[model samples]
Target: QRKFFVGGNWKMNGDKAAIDGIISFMKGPLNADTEVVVGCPQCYLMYTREHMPANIGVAAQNCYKTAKGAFTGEISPAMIKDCGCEWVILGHSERRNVFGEPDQLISEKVGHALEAGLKVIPCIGEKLEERESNRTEEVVFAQMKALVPNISDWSRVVIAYEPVWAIGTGKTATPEQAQDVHAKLRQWLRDNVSPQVAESTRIIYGGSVSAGNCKELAKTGDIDGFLVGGASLKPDFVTIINARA
Candidate 1:
């Protein structure tokens, strides 16, 4: 069975001082069975990693496809790895919707990041309209398909299912809803990829996950963990982290 894994994506939020306070406040016991990672802004990735507990790992919010390039404003996977980060969160809803990142572009980044020896959490989900229109499966499957060619090893990847509508909207996918999608994703892996990959890869949920709902959500057989956003910055995150405990 896959070990439960939880990742905190700080997104565009937090400064050095704020991050220091949050890390200081977060210092404490963590569930030994759960793997924890924090995805902080590029500017604070090193700082957060330096101050964060050794048991917790740091992730870059995003990274460029090339190791070194003319991508002026972008950081590369090599750079992220050099900063002591072992993970990167790509294809986040905000990156897809707000930044206009296409599926192929994100896939390229995933391939590069993995080659650079960094673990990747690639976000995939549908919008409310896609769900209402019953295109959820189709959308997520295509996203997964786009990523397959780039993935050389399944061990270094985790999939974060964050419904676009639920992200930062205070709405969440019911446990049943999230499980249904996650099961389908696992099946997709079995059919399109290998069974070992299907069963071993961690498929985590995101968007509006909080302490109140985390325990119930964690009960789902397929919900290996969570990719937390806003809640990750608060002390309540400790509750979510220990939901399984």
Candidate 2:
């Protein structure tokens, strides 16, 4: 069955104390049906996974394409799995815009992560300029095509469509707009990948998904879950997790 997954991409924010507080608030109180995952900065994944409740899993913000090596300052997929993190969010816009992780490298990372037994949340999106230029599908499809050779099973992965223009910018995509992209993405998956992959894989919306907007977005046939940003840091995150409630 397609699970109701809501992930918090904490990004570069939060320290040990903050992490503890968030977990304390979530434990025992979080809805039993929601599959909660939190992606924190790389520094805290091991600690968070060690202490986090069993029902909730920890995710890394990113990992290197290589399994391991003398690549200075790079954490590999094998190392992340060894550290006990169950999930990892790859190809976030920050990685693309700030660190310039190429599409080929991302595909390699996805393959490596899967080989290492780590679940993946593979992200794809169009920027404001691309959206405005009416090239959303072209951009997203190109990104997915690069991974076609690498993705073995859609069951082990979740696709999060986070439009770069709206993320953390207080400007959210309207429900219609979000659904339009999600529907197209699902159809693309069906056309390019297997039918089971298209039906079973989660196509989650991520750009500026707040409590106020998530419910409407979740009602769309194609939106299976969410990858929350700012709202995920607040009490409203609980509300977003229960969007289908």
Candidate 3:
């Protein structure tokens, strides 16, 4: 069975002072069964990694595809590695919809990030329109297909299934709704990727995951972990991290 995993993507919501506060709470008597990671802002990666416990992962929210880039306002994976962080969250929903980062761009980003030897959490999800229109599978599968070619190191990757409608909305998909998608993603991996990857690669839930709902969500077989947003900034994250307990 895959071990449980939880990541709190702080998502541009921390200063040094605030981070120190968060780190203090991270002195956790946390459940040993669950794997923990925290994604901090690009600039704070090193600070958070240095200040926090080594057992928990610190990740960059995004990174450019190339090592040396003249791309205005973009940073590379090498810089993230230089900051002593080993992880990156690629293809987040905001990167797709808000920033207009196309599927092709995200694919290149994932391949580049992995080649740089950084672990990747690549997010894929359906928007409200897509889900309401009953094309959730089609949308998510298409996202998966786009990511397939660039994912050179499956062992270094975790897939995040975050429903855009639920993200930051104080709403969570029903446990079964989340698990249903996770199962399909696992099936897609089994059929197109490999059985080993399907069995080993974790498909975690994201979007509005909190202490209130995380336990029921964790109860499902396929929901191997979470990629948290708003609730992560609070001490409640500790409770969510221990949902499996």
Candidate 4:
């Protein structure tokens, strides 16, 4: 069975003191059943790794496609792994839109991360314009297609579908919409990859997920977990984690 995995993409938010306080509070009260991964800015991955409770593991918000080098201002997957960060998030919507990273580049990043023994949460989704144009499936599939050739195995990866339109907009895909996309993704995996990959990979929903709505999304058979945004920074994050309860 696919284990439920939740990650907090703590984007460019939070100072050192605030992050430590937040981690201190969450460590003692996190859901042990949920595989909790917290993606902090690259600068804090080592610190979080050292201070985060045993229940939570630190992740890098982004990593370079190359394992190592003089790539100034870029953290390589190997560097992150060496610093005790076992997970890395790649192709987050912000990175794609803000930095103009292409699908081909993201695919390479995934391959590099995997080779470095880092678990990857590869983010994929359509923007507001694409969704409004009824091209969500096309856009999402294309992203997945690019990565398939580079992905050696889905076992070490988690997929987060964070609709660009809904992120930080106080909007969310309805349960039906979320399920439809996730089901299609699962089917695509079975067709393109292996049945074992399709069944074992955790596919998560991440657009505006919250304590109040997480349960509804969790009830969908295709949705394995969530990658929370704004809600993830608050105490209600605990509620979102126990959605199955």
Residue runs of model 3 more than 4 Å from their true location after superposition? 168-172
lDDT per model vs. reference: 0.90, 0.85, 0.91, 0.86
TM agreement with the true structure for every prediction:
0.97, 0.95, 0.97, 0.95
List ranges where model 2 is wrong by over 4 Å. 168-171
**Which pairs clash inside model 3?**
none
Model 1 worst lDDT run, 10 consecutive residues? 165-174
**How does model 1 fare in lDDT?**
0.90
Q: Please give the lDDT score at residue 103 for candidate 2.
A: 90
Candidate 1 lDDT tens digits, 1-245: 79999998888999988898779757867778999999999898789888888889899999999999788899999889888889999999899999999999999999999999999999999998888898999999999999999998899999999878665566766889999989999999999999999999999998678898899899798899999988999988888899898
Q: Give the TM-score of candidate 1.
A: 0.97
- Give the clashing pairs for model 1: none
Predicted structure with the largest lDDT when compared to the true one = 3
Candidate 1 vs candidate 2: the TM-score winner is 1
Cα-based lDDT at residue 118, candidate 2: 86
- Residue-level lDDT of model 4, residues 95-206, one tens digit each, is 8999998999999999999988889999999988898999998999999999988787677899999878776566766899889999999999999888988999999997
| Winner of 1 and 4 under lDDT | 1
Window of ten residues with lowest summed lDDT in model 2: 164-173
10 residues in a row with least lDDT, candidate 4: 24-33
